[PDB]
Symmetry: C2
Subunit: 266 residues, 2 copies
Amino acid sequence: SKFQQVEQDVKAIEVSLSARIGVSVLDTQNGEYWDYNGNQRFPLTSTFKTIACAKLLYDAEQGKVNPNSTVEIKKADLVTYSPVIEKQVGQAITLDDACFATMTTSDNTAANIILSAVGGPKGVTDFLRQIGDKETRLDRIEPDLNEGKLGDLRDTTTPKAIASTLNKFLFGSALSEMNQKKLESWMVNNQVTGNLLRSVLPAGWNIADRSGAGGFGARSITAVVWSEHQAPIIVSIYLAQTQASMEERNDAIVKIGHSIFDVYTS
Amino acid sequence: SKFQQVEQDVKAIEVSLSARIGVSVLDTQNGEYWDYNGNQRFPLTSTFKTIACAKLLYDAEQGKVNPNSTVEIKKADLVTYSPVIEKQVGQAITLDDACFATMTTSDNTAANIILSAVGGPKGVTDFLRQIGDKETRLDRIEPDLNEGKLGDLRDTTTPKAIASTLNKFLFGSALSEMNQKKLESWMVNNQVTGNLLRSVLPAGWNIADRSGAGGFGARSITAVVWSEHQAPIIVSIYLAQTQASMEERNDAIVKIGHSIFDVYTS
């Protein structure tokens, strides 16, 4: 009812882009929550990277791996779109650095590194199960995980499932406060999402975010927004199976974000 | 020779993406300059926005229009991807604000506003002619200027021509120092290009940039980079007529940028 307008904006976009669109919104202050197609499956694309760097930090707390330990970059390890790591062939990087890279620029080689240090796609999925995400699953590394094929279960989440997961990572007790704060910073210091929700963020609000794009037009973001008076709100927006232009898909996300934000500013 | 490697990276990309790629690089300290297909035509897409906000500032210096004067946003004026302006239907905006918006987020409605206050696509083209750009031309407003059709002359530049234009705007005398500094800031405070040259910028270097995407896979950036020891270098990269994914096109730009940057750091 509160989110009626959001719903109409979503329905319009779903028509104009001939797409599948999924949205979920969690208000942490009270326990209000809203979804459109919140149970449908969409490809994670790069929205997954949050989960693997939350694993790294968790697994470090348990003493199973050192984030100041360095991996060595070989030319043949490189995949499409690795700005940070392609500058460093024949140098070593701290996993800590590699998470900074993949969370802030979405460097894909850096993501593959992080994945190898936390038990692969199966490690990430097991982890999700242990915090009580029952839907989200990683199955492949970069770049094939972006394939985004219809009816393919691999590398998918639901808007609601990942919104809950992100809720628990940042505000639940799975992680130490310091490590929650680190993960927050990675997401707050994201450099590659100014064209999405940040571009419609109310003045003075904060935002921690992670976005995704891939195949058959998949486009998504998962974000936390908060402010002096507004307790954390978790937003999860996934598009898929569209031929819209990236620009059209980005436009869809900032319209939906603005409606969502409007709910909480009037 | 110095740029041999850059050239090989460009040739590779041109093959892998089955694309037309154009590059131009101006070193302002000495007068060195380099291009690949630097005379070929490519669509401006959003790389044009710089020219129209340089017009606004120039035309203000001449007393022909006030940048603290406000236009009124009507719902029916809105075009695809206008984050700032869609937040403000039934409010007024200073042209100054509208340039900030279109230069920092690439809001398209804001660009159309700026265009209407500087004599339209014909005003922009006349202006380019008067600073001695003979190739660059704007012919349409948003969004049709992004059409990027083969052999279409409208809304095109050459890598070299726009690189020279940007050179003159920032470092020539067409504009007052204060207004050069304003235009610099608009470009320095660009929020929507972290995934391009910024993601491979050498530590401590500065960057002022404006990027573009549109039709039949057009992708471009025009940027100035400088530092304590490195005098301004102007970079102009244009891709066109490709079916590559946005991610592939972004990857192409950061590879080429890194080669270019490498020239000047070893």
